[PDB]
């Protein structure tokens, strides 16, 4: 187990079976400036 | 300066139409980090997205424009690129009127209608840009296709103004 841990095998297995087989495939700032979407109606 | 005015009008009409058609065709509207099918640097347009680096580089995939009435309508309108296309159509008709003016100097309203087409093209262009940007919101940069659309708007409005000046001066001169 220690040898596997140090060779990265456990990390890779976790990555594979949590993320690489992940339905979502999401792995992840707010400026707070108003965006065009906040005033689009007034342009329309 | 009627000769020069007509020159500006014709050159400008062609320039606006060319820029807008290229923009609607080409695929450098947006630089983002999506996927052509890990996420890498891409370059999307109105219809296709493409990879800018790595193994699948040069590979492009049709944009899944689709995955709340307002969200539905925005997604619909952005999917079909109604407004960029309508602006291309109107620029085409404006160009037709500008060309037709010389071959039929009898009727005045031809160049007036050219001007109005150009103005309307600019308005459709604006709506397009807003819809595009708004639909994207639902890091990144804008490419040269986007700016082609923008410059098309500016030139279209200039040509519209010049056309209406031509019509005004014709009616002013002939009437008095």
Curated annotation (Swiss-Prot), chain A:
Record PTM text: Palmitoylated. Depalmitoylated by CPT1C and upon L-glutamate stimulation.
Subcellular location: Cell membrane; Endoplasmic reticulum membrane; Postsynaptic cell membrane; Postsynaptic density membrane
Tissue: Detected in cerebellum (at protein level).
Domain of life: Eukaryota
General remark: The postsynaptic actions of L-glutamate are mediated by a variety of receptors that are named according to their selective agonists. This receptor binds AMPA (quisqualate) > L-glutamate > kainate.
Domain free text: The M4 transmembrane segment mediates tetramerization and is required for cell surface expression.
Subunit description: Homotetramer or heterotetramer of pore-forming glutamate receptor subunits; heteromeric assembly can be the result of both receptor subtype and flip-flop forms and according the composition, one partner can be dominant with respect to the fast desensitizing current component, whereas the other can determine the steady-state component. Tetramers may be formed by the dimerization of dimers. Found in a complex with GRIA2, GRIA3, GRIA4, CNIH2, CNIH3, CACNG2, CACNG3, CACNG4, CACNG5, CACNG7 and CACNG8. Interacts with HIP1 and RASGRF2. Interacts with SYNDIG1 and GRIA2.
Function: Ionotropic glutamate receptor that functions as a ligand-gated cation channel, gated by L-glutamate and glutamatergic agonists such as alpha-amino-3-hydroxy-5-methyl-4-isoxazolepropionic acid (AMPA), quisqualic acid, and kainic acid. L-glutamate acts as an excitatory neurotransmitter at many synapses in the central nervous system.
The family this protein is said to belong to: Belongs to the glutamate-gated ion channel (TC 1.A.10.1) family. GRIA1 subfamily.
Protein name, per record: Glutamate receptor 1
Organism: Rattus norvegicus (Rat)
Upper classification of the organism: Eukaryota, Metazoa, Chordata, Craniata, Vertebrata
Gene name as annotated: Gria1
Residues of the full protein shown: 764 to 811 of 907
UniProtKB/Swiss-Prot annotation, chain B:
Domain of life: Eukaryota
Protein's GO biological process: neurotransmitter receptor localization to postsynaptic specialization membrane; positive regulation of synaptic transmission, glutamatergic; postsynaptic neurotransmitter receptor diffusion trapping; protein localization; protein targeting; regulation of AMPA receptor activity; transmission of nerve impulse
Topology of this chain in the membrane: Multi-pass membrane protein
Keywords carried by this UniProt record: Calcium, Calcium channel, Calcium transport, Ion channel, Ion transport, Membrane, Phosphoprotein, Transmembrane, Transmembrane helix, Transport, Voltage-gated channel
Subcellular location: Membrane
Chain segments annotated as transmembrane: 4-24, 80-100, 111-131, 148-168
GO CC annotation terms, alphabetical: AMPA glutamate receptor complex; dendrite; excitatory synapse; glutamatergic synapse; postsynaptic density membrane; Schaffer collateral - CA1 synapse; somatodendritic compartment
GO function terms (MF aspect): channel regulator activity; ionotropic glutamate receptor binding; PDZ domain binding; voltage-gated calcium channel activity
Subunit composition and interactions: The L-type calcium channel is composed of five subunits: alpha-1, alpha-2/delta, beta and gamma. Acts as an auxiliary subunit for AMPA-selective glutamate receptors (AMPARs). Found in a complex with GRIA1, GRIA2, GRIA3, GRIA4, CNIH2, CNIH3, CACNG2, CACNG4, CACNG5, CACNG7 and CACNG8. Interacts with AP4M1 and GRIA1; associates GRIA1 with the adaptor protein complex 4 (AP-4) to target GRIA1 to the somatodendritic compartment of neurons.
Function per UniProt: Regulates the trafficking to the somatodendritic compartment and gating properties of AMPA-selective glutamate receptors (AMPARs). Promotes their targeting to the cell membrane and synapses and modulates their gating properties by slowing their rates of activation, deactivation and desensitization. Does not show subunit-specific AMPA receptor regulation and regulates all AMPAR subunits. Thought to stabilize the calcium channel in an inactivated (closed) state.
Family the UniProt entry places it in: Belongs to the PMP-22/EMP/MP20 family. CACNG subfamily.
Name of protein: Voltage-dependent calcium channel gamma-3 subunit
The organism's taxonomic lineage, starting at the top: Eukaryota, Metazoa, Chordata, Craniata, Vertebrata
